[PDB]
Amino acid sequence: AAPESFDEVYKGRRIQGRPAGYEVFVDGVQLHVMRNADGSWISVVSHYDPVPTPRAAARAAVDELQGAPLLPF
Amino acid sequence: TVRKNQATLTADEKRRFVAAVLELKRSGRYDEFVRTHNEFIMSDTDSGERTGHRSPSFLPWHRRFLLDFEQALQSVDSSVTLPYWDWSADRTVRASLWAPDFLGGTGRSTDGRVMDGPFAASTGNWPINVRVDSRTYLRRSLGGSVAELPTRAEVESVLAISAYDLPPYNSASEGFRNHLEGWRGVNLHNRVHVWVGGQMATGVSPNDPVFWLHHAYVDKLWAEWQRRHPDSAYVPTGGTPDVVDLNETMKPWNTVRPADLLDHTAYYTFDAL
Ligand SMILES: [Cu+]
Ligand SMILES: [Cu+]
Ligand SMILES: [Cu+]
Ligand SMILES: [Cu+]
């Protein structure tokens, strides 16, 4: 099974996740994410740093961006 | 053809390396290395095709990618070679690596912007064009997201692993390649990217020139491993779906195989190995 969907405001920004095999959005801009064999996740803006869940990867991306708009991948 | 520890370069060598890197950026060639790398970061997956990362070919793929870049540098200045950063030794922000005459320092706390050295945005000479994070300036937070680089004792534990790689040949593998890459164990290569921060922690990590020096030292560790284990060699050795076997060719070049890249001395030597 893929993780559950999610939707929340984190540090002022909307992060959304949904099964697709999983998609993540930061303020409506899609963020490339990837699942590792052990079940952890990374995104393209934190791609050497595994975190346990896609929400955690979204939150890590918001932390990384420091308010900056994401560019469409 | 000799790759030297960054810490030993002369002032003239530092000057010529910086100038060659800046010319590749000016001419538009540098950014296409950033783009190549991001495409492979985003496509290499543990359950599908994997070539540049999370797979046995991580080491020969980066060896050839670095050779492409060094060749491009030598087209600007034939005296230049890639230096390597031994992060187990040069592990603080006050390494001359991070001096304004070489790569510049850590980023300021507000926005992570690098404010000195030849790659600071203020120079006008290092626009970040290939990007995901929309900002266009080089960023770093040295020691921000992880508080220590690997140590030599950690490196030694990894070099002692005799098997090159093991099934399932991905980020879950035991063996040398995945411990050096860092997805399992004490974590060498991945942790360094996390420690530098800024673009180095992202899929567009070659935006920071320290990328090349980090990978040149990872490449040296592969050479050291080979010396420690003459009886070990690249695996798998044929018929493995989705993974580059020893005698299969690698994208993007299509004309070179891991077998053609195991012996670095065909291309370069180290100052000491
Ligand atoms: Cu890479
Ligand atoms: Cu990815
Ligand atoms: Cu890397
Ligand atoms: Cu021996």
XYZ file of C-alpha atoms and ligand atoms in Angstrom:
350
model
C 0.000 0.000 0.000
C 1.201 3.567 -0.651
C 1.174 6.024 2.249
C -2.056 7.920 3.081
C -2.725 11.299 1.585
C -2.164 14.483 3.582
C -2.881 18.194 3.492
C -1.656 20.781 5.974
C -0.179 24.263 6.332
C 3.456 23.903 7.432
C 5.501 27.049 8.187
C 2.970 29.119 6.305
C 2.905 26.924 3.223
C 0.447 24.386 1.961
C 1.874 20.886 1.591
C -0.177 18.146 -0.018
C 0.552 14.471 -0.677
C -1.418 11.765 -2.448
C -0.928 8.327 -3.942
C -0.695 8.501 -7.700
C 3.532 6.145 -7.018
C 3.182 9.196 -4.789
C 2.869 12.925 -5.499
C 3.757 15.894 -3.253
C 2.904 19.553 -3.777
C 4.256 22.743 -2.134
C 1.756 25.590 -2.649
C 0.367 23.739 -5.644
C 3.761 23.167 -7.275
C 4.695 19.503 -7.675
C 7.809 18.409 -5.783
C 9.728 15.366 -7.075
C 9.900 12.750 -4.337
C 11.226 9.192 -4.289
C 10.779 6.232 -1.953
C 13.777 4.151 -0.897
C 13.652 0.348 -0.566
C 13.633 0.656 3.226
C 10.484 2.759 3.109
C 12.113 6.115 3.679
C 11.640 9.119 1.389
C 13.708 11.914 -0.139
C 12.833 14.819 -2.420
C 14.859 16.607 -5.062
C 15.649 19.404 -2.637
C 16.824 16.978 0.118
C 17.951 14.015 -1.975
C 20.764 12.637 0.239
C 18.845 12.740 3.473
C 16.244 10.020 3.993
C 13.204 10.849 6.161
C 10.488 8.424 7.207
C 7.394 9.623 5.301
C 6.330 11.761 2.361
C 4.975 14.405 4.707
C 8.397 14.526 6.311
C 9.912 14.994 2.869
C 7.472 17.810 2.143
C 8.254 19.477 5.448
C 12.006 19.070 4.742
C 11.460 20.820 1.425
C 9.641 23.744 3.065
C 12.517 23.991 5.551
C 14.997 23.993 2.628
C 13.150 26.581 0.551
C 13.171 29.346 3.205
C 10.058 30.862 1.625
C 11.219 30.507 -1.986
C 8.733 29.371 -4.627
C 9.390 25.908 -5.891
C 9.969 25.592 -9.588
C 7.993 22.934 -11.512
C 10.189 19.898 -12.112
C 47.266 13.730 -15.078
C 47.756 13.757 -11.243
C 44.846 14.419 -8.860
C 46.009 16.213 -5.746
C 44.572 16.795 -2.277
C 42.955 20.258 -2.380
C 44.870 21.163 0.784
C 48.182 20.927 -1.117
C 47.454 23.053 -4.144
C 49.643 26.078 -4.746
C 48.184 29.547 -5.097
C 48.757 29.264 -8.874
C 46.994 25.934 -9.074
C 44.005 27.317 -7.123
C 43.871 30.316 -9.435
C 43.924 28.223 -12.607
C 41.299 25.762 -11.349
C 38.892 28.558 -10.408
C 39.428 30.324 -13.724
C 38.761 27.138 -15.716
C 35.587 26.356 -13.764
C 34.342 29.945 -14.262
C 34.987 29.721 -17.985
C 32.995 26.521 -18.294
C 30.154 28.305 -16.475
C 30.448 31.381 -18.723
C 30.293 29.309 -21.906
C 27.200 27.383 -20.804
C 28.973 24.010 -20.591
C 29.022 23.823 -16.779
C 25.220 23.954 -16.424
C 24.775 20.954 -18.701
C 26.765 18.843 -16.224
C 24.367 20.033 -13.491
C 21.424 19.074 -15.699
C 22.774 15.632 -16.589
C 23.310 14.853 -12.964
C 19.811 15.944 -11.878
C 18.219 13.869 -14.621
C 19.961 10.757 -13.329
C 19.201 11.631 -9.651
C 15.575 11.872 -10.484
C 15.397 8.708 -12.578
C 17.613 6.184 -10.658
C 15.188 4.178 -8.474
C 15.574 1.193 -6.221
C 12.991 -0.935 -7.997
C 13.624 0.138 -11.608
C 16.482 1.164 -13.893
C 19.346 2.647 -11.867
C 22.711 3.761 -13.237
C 24.266 6.859 -11.684
C 23.283 6.290 -8.031
C 21.873 3.684 -5.612
C 23.472 0.928 -7.703
C 26.837 -0.751 -8.376
C 27.506 1.631 -11.229
C 27.466 4.637 -8.831
C 31.260 4.437 -8.683
C 32.222 3.956 -12.385
C 29.396 6.346 -13.475
C 30.800 9.121 -11.296
C 34.339 8.223 -12.368
C 33.392 8.815 -16.020
C 31.267 11.862 -15.191
C 34.283 13.399 -13.388
C 36.526 12.473 -16.335
C 34.110 14.328 -18.651
C 34.314 17.380 -16.415
C 38.104 17.244 -16.006
C 38.470 16.935 -19.780
C 36.286 20.005 -20.197
C 38.434 21.888 -17.704
C 41.568 20.805 -19.556
C 40.063 22.200 -22.803
C 40.227 25.626 -21.094
C 43.581 25.067 -19.327
C 45.494 21.837 -19.932
C 47.412 22.174 -16.665
C 44.234 21.757 -14.560
C 43.187 18.505 -12.890
C 40.426 17.814 -10.355
C 41.677 18.061 -6.790
C 40.111 15.946 -4.082
C 38.668 16.889 -0.694
C 39.554 14.476 2.058
C 36.687 15.442 4.365
C 37.825 12.974 7.035
C 40.844 15.275 7.608
C 39.742 18.708 6.467
C 36.560 18.699 8.554
C 36.014 22.253 9.748
C 34.878 25.477 8.099
C 38.460 26.809 8.465
C 39.919 24.395 6.006
C 41.639 26.492 3.325
C 39.145 24.756 0.964
C 36.560 27.239 2.150
C 38.862 30.225 1.890
C 37.966 33.161 -0.346
C 40.864 32.224 -2.698
C 39.363 28.791 -3.368
C 35.695 27.851 -2.958
C 34.496 30.516 -0.552
C 32.868 29.890 2.833
C 29.579 28.928 4.365
C 26.373 30.837 3.632
C 24.990 33.616 5.748
C 22.314 32.615 8.224
C 19.427 34.599 6.707
C 19.159 32.877 3.322
C 22.198 30.562 3.181
C 23.842 32.807 0.542
C 27.608 32.393 0.045
C 29.108 35.829 0.439
C 32.782 35.372 -0.440
C 35.057 33.508 -2.869
C 34.858 33.381 -6.608
C 31.404 31.682 -6.707
C 29.538 34.171 -4.553
C 26.495 35.549 -6.356
C 27.767 39.114 -5.835
C 30.613 38.512 -8.285
C 28.228 38.145 -11.190
C 30.130 35.017 -12.227
C 28.083 32.174 -10.772
C 24.393 32.335 -11.613
C 22.404 29.316 -10.462
C 20.403 28.493 -13.588
C 19.639 24.755 -13.338
C 17.545 24.734 -10.189
C 14.490 23.535 -8.384
C 14.654 25.834 -5.415
C 13.907 29.054 -7.297
C 16.758 31.108 -5.812
C 19.633 31.930 -8.186
C 22.564 32.298 -5.756
C 24.962 29.693 -4.419
C 23.966 28.550 -0.907
C 25.690 26.511 1.779
C 25.237 25.802 5.500
C 28.453 23.992 6.462
C 27.659 21.695 9.381
C 24.054 22.950 9.550
C 21.952 19.862 8.835
C 24.380 17.278 10.248
C 27.001 18.219 12.753
C 29.964 16.084 11.723
C 31.676 14.873 8.575
C 32.761 11.224 8.499
C 35.925 10.466 10.433
C 38.914 8.444 9.286
C 37.905 5.549 11.621
C 34.537 5.555 9.925
C 36.168 5.601 6.515
C 38.379 2.703 7.553
C 35.382 0.612 8.603
C 33.928 1.016 5.117
C 37.184 0.309 3.259
C 37.407 -2.955 5.192
C 34.231 -4.324 3.593
C 35.402 -6.934 1.073
C 32.361 -7.393 -1.154
C 32.016 -4.695 -3.803
C 28.237 -4.805 -3.845
C 25.463 -7.344 -3.125
C 21.975 -8.120 -4.385
C 19.519 -6.415 -4.556
C 22.152 -3.908 -5.828
C 20.307 -0.825 -4.558
C 19.977 1.471 -1.542
C 19.138 -1.559 0.674
C 22.356 -3.425 -0.144
C 25.081 -4.514 2.214
C 28.701 -4.256 0.941
C 31.233 -1.602 0.026
C 29.511 0.454 -2.635
C 26.369 1.161 -0.606
C 28.301 1.889 2.583
C 30.536 4.318 0.663
C 27.490 5.827 -1.022
C 25.938 6.051 2.435
C 22.409 4.624 2.297
C 23.427 2.000 4.847
C 25.731 2.236 7.805
C 27.769 5.055 9.223
C 27.235 7.003 5.924
C 30.149 8.560 3.976
C 29.137 10.122 0.656
C 25.523 11.103 1.323
C 26.370 12.674 4.685
C 28.929 14.976 3.072
C 26.280 16.370 0.728
C 24.007 16.910 3.739
C 26.837 18.589 5.685
C 27.599 21.146 2.952
C 23.887 21.998 2.564
C 22.660 24.486 0.017
C 22.551 23.173 -3.524
C 24.927 20.319 -2.544
C 22.077 18.756 -0.547
C 19.824 18.658 -3.669
C 19.502 16.937 -7.023
C 21.325 19.905 -8.604
C 24.368 19.388 -6.341
C 26.994 20.025 -9.084
C 25.914 23.677 -8.873
C 28.530 23.872 -6.086
C 32.110 23.332 -7.405
C 32.832 21.389 -4.190
C 30.810 18.552 -5.824
C 33.771 17.649 -7.971
C 36.231 17.643 -5.060
C 33.892 15.495 -2.918
C 33.395 12.985 -5.755
C 37.137 12.985 -6.545
C 37.764 11.818 -2.947
C 34.973 9.215 -3.094
C 36.660 8.037 -6.292
C 39.974 7.842 -4.479
C 38.341 5.734 -1.734
C 37.234 3.319 -4.464
C 40.881 3.100 -5.584
C 42.016 2.554 -1.977
C 39.406 -0.190 -1.561
C 40.740 -1.937 -4.654
C 44.238 -1.925 -3.110
C 42.915 -3.368 0.140
C 41.062 -6.120 -1.680
C 42.872 -7.223 -4.852
C 40.628 -10.337 -4.872
C 37.364 -8.343 -5.045
C 35.973 -6.719 -8.172
C 32.878 -5.086 -9.571
C 29.622 -7.043 -9.462
C 27.199 -8.028 -10.866
C 28.887 -9.797 -13.771
C 26.060 -10.411 -16.195
C 22.386 -10.742 -16.789
C 21.007 -8.449 -14.089
C 17.818 -6.532 -15.015
C 17.872 -2.811 -14.438
C 21.452 -2.764 -13.128
C 24.653 -2.195 -15.136
C 26.622 -5.392 -15.202
C 30.406 -5.367 -15.473
C 30.478 -5.616 -19.287
C 27.318 -3.594 -20.048
C 27.539 -0.018 -21.241
C 26.291 2.940 -19.229
C 24.058 5.835 -20.106
C 24.482 8.632 -21.046
C 27.661 7.756 -22.964
C 26.495 4.343 -24.149
C 30.052 3.469 -25.285
C 31.774 2.670 -21.977
C 31.305 -0.134 -19.465
C 32.199 -0.417 -15.771
C 34.972 -2.761 -16.950
C 36.561 0.119 -18.813
C 36.688 2.270 -15.717
C 37.931 -0.008 -12.929
C 41.574 0.975 -13.390
C 41.925 4.671 -12.817
C 45.612 4.658 -13.804
C 44.570 4.535 -17.425
C 43.346 8.096 -16.876
C 45.083 9.632 -13.869
C 47.123 8.886 -10.739
C 46.815 10.338 -7.225
C 49.437 12.357 -5.420
C 49.545 9.424 -2.999
C 47.452 6.295 -2.954
Cu 25.761 11.927 -8.506
Cu 14.472 11.252 -7.038
Cu 27.485 12.906 -4.651
Cu 47.363 -9.600 -0.197
